[PDB]
From TrEMBL, chains A, D:
<keyword id="KW-0813">Transport</keyword>
<keyword id="KW-0795">Thyroid hormone</keyword>
<dbReference type="GO" id="GO:0005179">
    <property type="term" value="F:hormone activity"/>
</dbReference>
<keyword id="KW-0732">Signal</keyword>
<comment type="subunit">
    <text>Homotetramer.</text>
</comment>
<dbReference type="GO" id="GO:0070324">
    <property type="term" value="F:thyroid hormone binding"/>
</dbReference>
<comment type="function">
    <text>Thyroid hormone-binding protein. Probably transports thyroxine from the bloodstream to the brain.</text>
</comment>
<comment type="similarity">
    <text>Belongs to the transthyretin family.</text>
</comment>
<feature type="domain" description="Transthyretin/hydroxyisourate hydrolase">
    <location>
        <begin position="1"/>
        <end position="115"/>
    </location>
</feature>
UniProtKB/TrEMBL annotation, chains B, C:
<comment type="function">
    <text>Thyroid hormone-binding protein. Probably transports thyroxine from the bloodstream to the brain.</text>
</comment>
<keyword id="KW-0732">Signal</keyword>
<feature type="domain" description="Transthyretin/hydroxyisourate hydrolase">
    <location>
        <begin position="1"/>
        <end position="114"/>
    </location>
</feature>
<keyword id="KW-0372">Hormone</keyword>
<dbReference type="GO" id="GO:0006144">
    <property type="term" value="P:purine nucleobase metabolic process"/>
</dbReference>
<keyword id="KW-0795">Thyroid hormone</keyword>
<dbReference type="GO" id="GO:0005179">
    <property type="term" value="F:hormone activity"/>
</dbReference>
<keyword id="KW-0813">Transport</keyword>
<dbReference type="GO" id="GO:0005576">
    <property type="term" value="C:extracellular region"/>
</dbReference>
């Protein structure tokens, strides 16, 4: 699997479980095609989110529904979502991990890309 | 002015100057209408980005052109753009500052709401 | 003034007021001498923390009492303290701002150096 | 093993390999006893850093030598070190992961604590 996530909760000090997300692929006219969805497990991950065949070179957007996560925790969130948008170059089985650290009014996102 | 930004560069330890951005408001059908553009000054800020009259409650997106920023700094970036999407509640002259801390492969974003 | 701070609270979206801190400079033998203390105001800042005369080059530590801050906010914290340790190069009236973004189990810290 | 680290490099998008660190335990008179040292592997980790017997309840400091890491990468760093100081409550095999995200002038650190 070429696309992984890892979400952490900076209030409780745990992975962020049960965060819904969507993966989309940019189209030529500037639109977006939804290619996968899921909800993180208790480790803040979604295993086998997409296949290599689903992940050709191009621009991808991963939208994480952080607002619902905070509402369920009892916190008042600032952001509607956290968006991560990047150009993927999957040749040679290059892998992408999108790391995300959540607080009610803030997030940090980084990427780990293999070679 | 109800919407401010403060952008810092985590590599060189300065504000991030000359970062282009676009502000959009979400429509009832789920699309986006662009309402303003700007470019940060050497303090990482943009003065008078929009007016209160342009800022009813609703969902807004600020799209920061971080890819161009990092290319111009000479460092290969990861993100195509940095988007900050938030629901505004301006009643009571509430003001919003979007703070943004940039690295080539990472950013942190937070808000200060008065 | 050559040393400033800016502390934000990532839970409530405000500056972090009433955060206590202590500034120390490292001695030649590797110990620490405390040179100043302060407490942030409601903007998350401390004005006139030290003077240029108190700020030769060297290694400095700022110790922020984040555990007390979070206990007072009513949220269990992880860290006992947040320490920022850096080598200062004041020649040329160079000024340092320590930016700090706090959550109960996490912090981000960066610097703006003029 | 009750104490793990995970260090990432926010410039290159990789784990931060070959970062030296030290683990110390606070003493009653306010001093520090060094209990372990190591250097991260290419995954940004140190496996089996300490044992459970080495990790009684108390205050611990993990000092990461980030300055040398950036000098080797060719960057000019701000911080001398990154310090993480916390009170450990290891009963019930509670585990601590210290996550650290590095840039030349900035770091983010969070903890993942099990239960
Ligand atoms: C403290 C900070 C961080 Cl941690 C990251 C990005 C900008 C900032 N700074 C600010 N954010 C909001 C308003 C003012 C500032 C400032 O630095 O003056
Ligand atoms: C270190 C870290 C930070 Cl600083 C923020 C969010 C997730 C992580 N953790 C990871 N990121 C990527 C891959 C693995 C991990 C992990 O913690 O196992």
């Amino acid at each position: 699997c070429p696309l992984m996530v890892k979400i952490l909760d900076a209030v409780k000090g745990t992975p962020a479980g049960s965060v819904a997300l969507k993966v989309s692929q940019k189209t030529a006219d500037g639109g977006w095609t939804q290619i996968a969805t899921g909800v993180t497990d208790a480790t803040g991950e979604i295993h086998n989110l997409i296949t290599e065949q689903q992940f050709p070179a191009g621009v991808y957007r991963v939208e994480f529904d952080t607002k619902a996560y905070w509402t369920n925790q009892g916190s008042t969130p600032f952001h509607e979502v956290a968006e991560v948008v990047f150009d993927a170059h999957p040749e040679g089985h290059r892998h992408y991990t999108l790391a995300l650290l959540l607080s009610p009014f803030s997030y940090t996102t980084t990427a780990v890309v293999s070679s």
